[PDB]
Design a protein around this ligand. Sequence first.
Ligand SMILES: O=C(O)CCCC[C@@H]1SC[C@@H]2NC(=O)N[C@@H]21
Ligand SMILES: O=C(O)CCCC[C@@H]1SC[C@@H]2NC(=O)N[C@@H]21
Ligand SMILES: O=C(O)CCCC[C@@H]1SC[C@@H]2NC(=O)N[C@@H]21
Ligand SMILES: O=C(O)CCCC[C@@H]1SC[C@@H]2NC(=O)N[C@@H]21
Lengths: 120, 119, 122, 120
Amino acid sequence: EAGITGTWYNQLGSTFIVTAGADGALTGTYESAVGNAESRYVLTGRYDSAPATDGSGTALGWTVAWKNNYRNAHSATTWSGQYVGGAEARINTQWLXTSGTTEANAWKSTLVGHDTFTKV
Amino acid sequence: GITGTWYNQLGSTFIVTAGADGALTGTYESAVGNAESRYVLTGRYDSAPATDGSGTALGWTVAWKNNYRNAHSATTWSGQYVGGAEARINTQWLXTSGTTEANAWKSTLVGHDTFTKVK
Amino acid sequence: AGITGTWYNQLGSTFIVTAGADGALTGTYESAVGNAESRYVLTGRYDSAPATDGSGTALGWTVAWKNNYRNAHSATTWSGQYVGGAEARINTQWLXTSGTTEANAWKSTLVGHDTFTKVKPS
Amino acid sequence: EAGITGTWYNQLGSTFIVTAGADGALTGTYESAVGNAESRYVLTGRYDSAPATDGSGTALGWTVAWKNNYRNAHSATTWSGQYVGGAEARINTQWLXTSGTTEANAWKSTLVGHDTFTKV
Ligand SMILES: O=C(O)CCCC[C@@H]1SC[C@@H]2NC(=O)N[C@@H]21
Ligand SMILES: O=C(O)CCCC[C@@H]1SC[C@@H]2NC(=O)N[C@@H]21
Ligand SMILES: O=C(O)CCCC[C@@H]1SC[C@@H]2NC(=O)N[C@@H]21
Ligand SMILES: O=C(O)CCCC[C@@H]1SC[C@@H]2NC(=O)N[C@@H]21
């Protein structure tokens, strides 16, 4: 997809390099400006390869597990959201970060936030 | 010990392979909502989890489009796998529907699914 | 019957609530976990005229995690529904926000789900 | 503390009128510019009345049940957040809306988002 494929950046300065395949796949890398993270991490996702043409955005999602060759955070984040094309295009997301925990700590495994991505 | 067939409390069926270098790939069949048959899923998991008996962090996405139906929709599950005795994948989820900018504020459902090895 | 009661969640926390007749929820919350001890004030609101087709009764409430013993600089809100019947239940999802710097604001917020029954644990 | 009490507005045009009591109570009204809402609704909540002084925000939250004299949506929204001071005062929140549903529809009961409130 000739909208989503690209390098994006969020309000935190993280970098989201992604390819939208014509089968609906998202593949690429993510580098977080914050948290227990360094360099690039593999990502994978899906998006709607045949969106409605009524002004609606294009639904998508992706996952990072925060292990690469330099560092393991024992944690993973999913972003669920939509691509808004056109003028200044955006990916608006909400995200769930889950840490590996004990059964006793499982109640505090999950952070929630919103990230917004632009090409600038 | 993730690879296999898992079921959530709604009767949905999550068929998944955990590749050696952290990939999750497979299919999801939802028992509810605007869905029929299988959907592709991909995701990631921590292939080197802490061995202090913490669960294994993971997540996956399904875009709700296959050859039968397109809900203009995508869900991510974020969670952890706990093995052993009565093994479980405990998740929370975010479904975003495609909406106009005017209805963006209501784009997103939230919930929780517990997946288990027994139906 | 109803919401007014002493409720307990899967964690063993204790939710003592009164449902006032024009929508108010008042009571105390004691958490078994986290940076907290003893009871905390809560307030909240509920649908005082639910549907009558089986639909649950929508509600929510807030606890700010400051009492006389401790201050966590935190607040949780539970959003959910009361289901009546065989064993009354309050299913919830909750959002805990800590006071953070502007720089740490991205990580201010935990999310979970708490299910409450009237059954005491031991 | 001082700064919460007042009239606030979020990015959707909604109006949040709130009084912070010195004991940690929040009371007031909430007019939503969207959804199945009309006119004012009662809110209550709580805030950390003795917040840290390292410019950290003040934790807070409130509830609105969407029933007033005009209308009943069979639903309730909680906002959880923090107040942040200075020349650009704001209340940054994430919110959960729960609709009353049948037991079969429990899984789809809850909507999530984020509101940013600004001091006029
Ligand atoms: O610290 C960890 O557990 C791993 C790094 C997490 C960074 C988070 S994920 C959501 C948010 N968006 C970002 O780009 N960074 C943070
Ligand atoms: O209706 C749609 O938009 C597509 C199907 C959504 C079904 C939801 S996603 C979360 C939840 N868990 C399931 O197993 N199914 C539902
Ligand atoms: O640690 C804090 O900041 C205050 C205590 C938080 C306890 C959380 S709120 C959600 C979950 N459910 C409970 O009953 N307790 C924990
Ligand atoms: O439609 C309903 O069920 C009642 C109105 C809900 C309004 C929502 S709640 C969060 C969001 N922020 C607002 O100010 N309004 C919407």
